[model samples]
Target: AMYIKVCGLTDPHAIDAAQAAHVDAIGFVHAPTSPRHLTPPHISTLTATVDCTIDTVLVVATTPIADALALAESTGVSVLQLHGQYSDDDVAYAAARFPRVWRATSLSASPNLTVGAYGEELLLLDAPQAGSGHTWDFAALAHRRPTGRWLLAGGLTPDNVADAITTTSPWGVDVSSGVESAPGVKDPAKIAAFVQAARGVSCPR
Candidate 1:
């Protein structure tokens, strides 16, 4: 089955809901500009409470590699998702320092961008808005096939995730604001529904 990652979780209730849904990974936003952003202490507490088997991912945008490494070390994040413009060298450096790295790219701009070798880095394809709750041109993404393992994200909700999976055929799908009632406020029902929708879909190999 394709992986499912629920991002931008802040409180215990939301985390609880994600855990109950049995998502492949849970993300905590570390981006200062995002409303869902959490502090180091917040991340520490959340990560500590989750099961060891579930991967914890830290979402960051244009963050310094030092800070990213420190956060990963402190929070025990299994994956570091970088949403900013970082070169292959930057990703390589971070991957060398951290066990896993997810390099985020915008769907609108990534069609022309070359995804050369980056060792074991994972590509995270997201809408331009990141978590701004805006939809993108799904057809554009559907036409382009990713060269590596990529997680599709952007405006993903319970209502449309299955369509996204069938269209893009990504290795995984990630959701954040789509499962929230509002910014930083996740709805348990929405989370469960979104996970179910994504997991139930069949994708092209």
Candidate 2:
């Protein structure tokens, strides 16, 4: 099955939409500056309703590892996605403490080619400016690809997700603003359509 994660979930209605779409995972934003940002208590309340089959991920950008750890613990999220400039050592330490750690970085930042180089279980390559609803040149990765599990993110929508998957052949796909009715607001129909479009493709082995 294609691994699809609908990120930036804020409410039970959106969570219900994602679960109904059968996504493999759901991400809750923890970065304060983000419109989708949710407090630890709020995330915990939202996560309480999540189905066990779907993994819960906490997305943090530029948050101190110590604070991130506390936030993750408070929210009881099973996975931590470090989307900041955390050092390899910081990530390695975080991996030791969490069930899973995913490293997210901009492709233009020259991210490490090795998936587990920073002790991350997965790596995510996003657009130069993430969450901007802009598409990147995924075809460029055809020649220079990461060696292990990775997800393709950034400006993906139901209309273009299939083509992007065909172009990059990534292990999975993650989306935040793509299925939104607006910034920080999820559209249930769009969420369902995006999942359907992504799963319609056959991921390369």
Candidate 3:
């Protein structure tokens, strides 16, 4: 089965929908500018309500290392994703405190193509603008794809994920605005549809 992640989840009902759909993981944003942003307290509350079967991830961009660690500690999320202009030292510092950390960057940034290059466990490839709900030329990477455990994100939706997966062969897939009814609002039906589409292509017939 494919590893599917639905991000920017706000409400418990949305978390319930993701779990019901059997998503591999769910994310809570901490970036202030994003409409999906959740404060540490809110993240803690939501994480407490999540099923043990689902992994909870904390997403941050340009947040101070101390603040990011504080949020991870208070929220009890299993993974910390550094999605902004974080240096390698920042990742190392975060990974030292937390057991798991993932690095996210846009295609235009031209980050290291290898996973763990920043001492993080995984890498997430996003569009030039993260959370913009706009697709990029991931199809162009057919020849020189990223190495190691990497996820394809940025503008993925239930309707396009199958094609995206088939074209890129990413180890996993992630979506935020793509599953939303509006900014920061997750649509349960869209969540279910995305899971179905992601699984259909990866599962053996």
Candidate 4:
């Protein structure tokens, strides 16, 4: 019940709803085939209407530095959340150039639970494929929980977020499809309900 970042934005209504719910961060997707995919230029405009109180995150999937730089210059994004098989140098590259960069991967990609084993400022453990809505086998993380700030992602919904937090003790949680009526669609009621349910319990650490 700490930070709640709702990623995969394609609508301003989502932003309005999330802000009303008082979530910590808002994220825009830049994946290849995601229904929620939106480029940096689009992110710039969507986030323009957003208040500075909530952080804006630019989400990309194993992106190149050149394009990343372009996005950085175009969008005054608050954080860069990269998902995929980005190398340490890639992570370091973004970390060096960007203001704040959070690395996201699956247990298969980083089984050691080495959050920031690369140069990422923060870490997010997503499903095997980004935004697939399939939960990972949490047992893999049981013996080797991360020490620093790390978010638990994948298949998080209002009904199950409290249980996930209680089990994983993550510093925070990230949701996308979980709060949606369908892919690329953000549900206001679900968004509000998720924040309410998650904050209702003090996650065990």
**Highest lDDT, which number?**
2
Arranged by lDDT with the best first, the candidates are 2, 3, 4, 1
The candidate scoring highest on TM-score is: 3
Candidate 4 lDDT over 24-119, as tens digits, reads 999988877788888766888998877988888888875686587568667888888877666667887888787788988776664446767767
User: lDDT tens string, model 1, 38-68?
Assistant: 9999999998888975789998886787888
Off-target runs (Cα >4 Å) in candidate 4 are 127-138, 203-205
Reference-based TM-score, model 3: 0.92
> Which candidate, 2 or 3, would have the higher TM-score against the true structure?
3
**How many backbone collisions does model 4 have?**
0
TM-score list, all predictions = 0.87, 0.91, 0.92, 0.89
- List model 3 lDDT by residue over 55-118, tens digit each: 8999999689988988888899989999858887898899888889998877778777788876
Q: For candidate 4, give the lDDT.
A: 0.79
Model 2 is weakest, by summed lDDT over 10 consecutive residues, at 127-136
Name the 10 consecutive residues with the lowest summed lDDT in model 1: 128-137
Clashing pairs in 4: none
Whole-model lDDT per candidate? 0.79, 0.83, 0.83, 0.79
Cα misplacement distance, residue 164 of candidate 2 (Å):
0.7
> How do all the candidates rank in terms of TM-score, highest first?
3, 2, 4, 1
